[PDB]
Design a protein around this ligand. Structure first.
Ligand SMILES: Cc1cc2c(cc1C)N(C[C@H](O)[C@H](O)[C@H](O)COP(=O)(O)O)c1[nH]c(=O)[nH]c(=O)c1N2
Ligand SMILES: Cc1cc2c(cc1C)N(C[C@H](O)[C@H](O)[C@H](O)COP(=O)(O)O)c1[nH]c(=O)[nH]c(=O)c1N2
Ligand SMILES: CC(=O)[C@H]1CCCN(Cc2ccccc2)C1
Ligand SMILES: CC(=O)[C@H]1CCCN(Cc2ccccc2)C1
Lengths: 359, 359
C-alpha cells in the first residue's frame, strides 16, 4: 500500500503517508490549551497517523478566530503544548503545529455558537486587522483596520516568536497558515488587498508579506525540520486560471526561500464563489502544483476514504494525504484504512493493548 | 432506538444502554495507572457510551493477573484513579470499576508477551492463591497455594478496602469480578474447589465466599450507587444444564443480598471446554438469568454490531449491552452505532467540537 509507506523529509521520517491536518477545537481559554486537547491529540496519534499537525494556533491574541482558539503568543502558552508534543511522540507519530493569524475573519463566535462575527456590543470581541479596510461580508461583516507598517513588522515578529516557541516546545514540523482567507491569504489576494505601498499592487508586493514572513521564520526554524505552509491556490471566483498561474509562481518562490512542502488548499478569501465540493476534488490541482512548482505537497477536502487516499498517492498527485473529519469521527481511522487496504498485520497500526486483541 | 434510551439504577442515570465492559490494558506499573489509561478511558467516554467500567483492578498485589495490571490495594493506588474518574464524568459517561483477584491465574505474562504463567526463575513472578492446590493446566501450569480461613478473611477485607477506596475516588458503579476463572469463580466451581471445610463441597459452601464477599462489600459501598458483579454462569464443559441451574439460584441469592445488576458471562474455569463462540451467543443465556432470577443483566461477546445490540434490548434479553473490542477499534463506536440505527442528530452523541462538523 502506498498509503502505508514511510516518508522522509529533512531529518523527519513519518511512519506512513496519513497526515492529520490542523483542525480548530475552539476549546482553549485565553489561548491556553487544556485537557480537551491533551486527549484529543493523544488519542488520534495512537490511532496510527504518521503526522499530526496541531490546529491553527494564533501568533497574537487578535489573530485568534474565536475566544476559544489556541494561542502561542507567550512562553506560558508554548509550555502548555509540551505534554501534547510528548504524547504525539510517545504514540510514534510526528508532532506538527500550524501557526496562524485570522486577519479580517477574527473576532468570530464558535461555529456551533453562531459562527458569525462578534457584535460591537459584546465584550468578548475585538478589533481586527487586515491589509486593507474591507469586510469579507456575509456572516463576517466587521470592517478590519488597515495595517500600518509597524503593524506589518510586529506581526512578522509574532510569527518568528511563535516559531521559536514551537521549536523549543519540541514540535518537529511547522506549517504557516497562508490559506483560507486569513491574514496571509488576504495579502496575496487582489480581492482583499488594495494597498498602494510596498505590500500591495503588483505580484511582487502582494507576495511580499508572505515571503518576508517565510524568510523571517526560516531564520529561527531548524534547517533539519520540515518548514511548510498552507496556501489557497485558487478561489473558484471565475479567475481560476490566472489565479492558479500566479499561485504556482509564488510556490516557486516559496521553494527558493526554503519551503519543504506545500499544503494545497482553496483561498476562501471572499464569499462570492462556486466551490465544486466532492470526493478528492483537489487531486488534480494539487498534482499541477506539485509538478509545476517541483515541491512536495499534501491536500485535503474529500480524501477521507481509504481507496481515494491510496489512489491519489499512486497517481503521484500528493506526497501525503490529509484526512481530517474522518479522524473526528474515528480517532483510529488509520487502523480502519490499513484494514480496508489489506495491509499485513493491520491491527498493529495500533499500540499493543489494542493490536493484540484485534488481529 | 432502544440502544439510545437512558437507564436508571439506584441514583445513577446512564445516557444510553451502551456499556464499555472492563478491558485490561496491561500498562500499569506496580499497580499504578498512568498516561496510557488517562487517554484510553477519557477518549472512549467522549465517544458516547453511557457507562465505562474500568478494567479489572487487583485488590491485592498477588491478585494481579500480570505485572502490568492495575491495582487498588493502597490509598496511593486509589488516588491515581481520580483524574480517570473525573475525565469520564466530564465527558458525560458514568465511571465504574471492576475489582478483582486473579486467583490461580495470577502471575502471568502480558498476552502479547507469551500470555503464559511466569517461570519460577523470572524475577517478576509471585506465589498465587486459590481454594485448592490445583492448576488450571495448559499455559497456566503453576499450582496455587490452598487458602486458609485466615486467607479468606484477609481477601474479603481487601475487597472491602478496595470498594471503600473506589467510593472515595468517585466511582459511581462497582463490579465484583466473580467470573472468568479467577478467585471467586474458582470458589464456586467444583472443578477447582475441592475444599472439605465451610467453603467447599455443597452448593451452600461453594457459594459462601462469593456471598460473604458481597455482604462485606455491601457494608461500605453506598446504598444509592449500583452494586454489581460479573459471574460465569456456565463453562461449556458438558455440565451446562445443572451448572446453569445452580448459577441462577446463586443469582437469586445475590439479589437477596442487595446486588443491583448482574453481568452474565462464561466461567473459563478450566481449559477442557467447547465454547460456541458466535455473534450474540450469550443472548439467550442472559435472558434466562434475567427472567428466572428477576434481576437486571448485561452481557458481551459479539454484541458489537449496532443491529445485534438493538435486537437484544428489544427482545428484553439484556438491560445494557456491553461492547468491548469494538471500542478498542474505534473509541467513538457509540457514534457509529447511533448513525447506523438512524438516531436523530446522531453526531451529537459526540461533543460539540466533533458533532458540529459531522452533522
Ligand atoms: C473542525 C475543523 C477545523 C478546521 C478545519 C476543518 C474542520 C472540520 N480545517 C480544514 C481541514 O484542515 C481540512 O482541510 C478539511 O477538514 C477537509 O479535509 P477532510 O475532508 O475533513 O478530510 C483547518 N484548516 C486549517 O488550515 N487550520 C485549521 O485549524 C483548520 N480547522
Ligand atoms: C483487552 C481485553 C481485556 C479484557 C477483556 C477483553 C479484552 C478484549 N475482558 C472481557 C471483555 O470485558 C468482554 O467481555 C469481551 O471483550 C467480549 O465483549 P466484545 O465481543 O469484545 O464486545 C475482561 N473481562 C473482565 O471481566 N475484566 C476485564 O478486565 C477484562 N479484560
Ligand atoms: C482556521 C481554519 O483554516 C478553518 C477554521 C474553520 C473552517 N475551515 C474551513 C472549512 C470549511 C468547510 C468545512 C471544514 C472546514 C477553516
Ligand atoms: C481479567 C479479565 O476477565 C480478562 C483478561 C483477559 C481475557 N479475558 C477473557 C477473554 C478471552 C478471549 C477474548 C477476550 C477476553 C478475561
Amino acid at each position: 500500500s502506498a498509503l502505508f509507506e514511510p516518508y522522509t523529509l529533512k531529518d523527519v521520517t513519518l511512519r506512513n503517508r496519513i497526515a492529520i491536518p490542523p483542525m480548530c477545537q475552539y476549546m482553549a481559554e485565553d489561548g491556553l490549551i487544556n485537557d480537551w486537547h491533551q486527549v484529543h491529540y493523544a488519542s488520534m496519534a495512537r490511532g496510527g497517523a504518521g503526522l499530526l499537525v496541531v490546529e491553527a494556533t494564533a501568533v497574537a491574541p487578535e489573530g485568534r478566530i474565536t475566544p476559544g482558539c489556541a494561542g502561542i503568543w507567550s512562553d506560558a502558552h508554548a509550555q502548555a503544548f509540551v505534554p501534547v508534543v510528548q504524547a504525539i511522540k510517545a504514540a510514534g507519530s510526528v508532532p506538527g503545529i500550524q501557526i496562524a493569524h485570522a486577519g479580517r475573519k477574527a473576532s468570530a463566535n464558535r461555529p456551533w455558537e453562531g459562527d458569525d462575527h462578534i457584535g460591537a456590543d459584546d465584550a468578548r470581541g475585538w478589533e481586527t486587522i487586515a491589509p486593507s479596510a474591507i469586510a469579507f461580508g456575509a456572516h463576517l461583516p466587521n470592517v478590519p483596520r488597515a495595517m500600518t507598517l509597524d503593524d506589518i513588522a510586529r506581526v512578522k515578529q509574532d510569527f518568528v516568536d511563535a516559531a521559536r516557541r514551537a521549536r523549543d516546545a519540541g514540535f518537529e514540523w511547522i506549517e504557516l497558515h497562508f490559506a483560507h482567507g486569513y491574514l496571509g491569504q488576504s495579502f496575496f489576494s487582489e480581492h482583499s488587498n488594495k494597498r498602494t505601498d510596498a505590500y500591495g499592487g503588483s505580484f511582487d508586493n502582494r507576495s511580499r508579506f508572505l515571503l518576508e514572513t517565510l524568510a523571517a521564520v526560516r531564520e529561527v526554524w531548524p534547517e533539519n525540520l520540515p518548514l511548510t505552509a498552507r496556501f489557497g491556490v485558487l478561489e473558484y471566483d471565475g479567475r481560476d486560471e490566472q489565479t492558479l498561474e500566479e499561485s504556482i509562481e509564488l510556490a516557486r518562490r516559496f521553494k527558493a526561500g526554503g519551503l519543504d512542502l506545500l499544503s494545497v488548499s482553496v483561498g476562501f478569501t471572499i464569499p462570492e464563489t462556486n466551490i465544486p465540493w466532492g470526493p478528492a476534488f483537489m487531486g488534480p490541482i494539487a498534482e499541477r502544483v506539485r509538478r509545476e512548482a517541483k515541491l512536495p505537497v499534501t491536500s485535503a477536502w474529500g480524501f477521507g476514504t481509504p481507496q481515494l487516499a491510496e489512489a491519489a498517492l499512486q497517481a503521484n498527485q500528493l506526497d501525503l494525504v490529509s484526512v481530517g473529519r474522518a479522524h473526528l469521527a474515528d480517532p483510529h481511522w488509520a487502523y480502519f484504512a490499513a484494514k480496508e487496504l489489506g495491509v499485513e498485520k493491520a491491527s498493529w497500526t495500533l499500540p499493543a493493548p489494542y493490536a493484540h486483541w484485534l488481529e
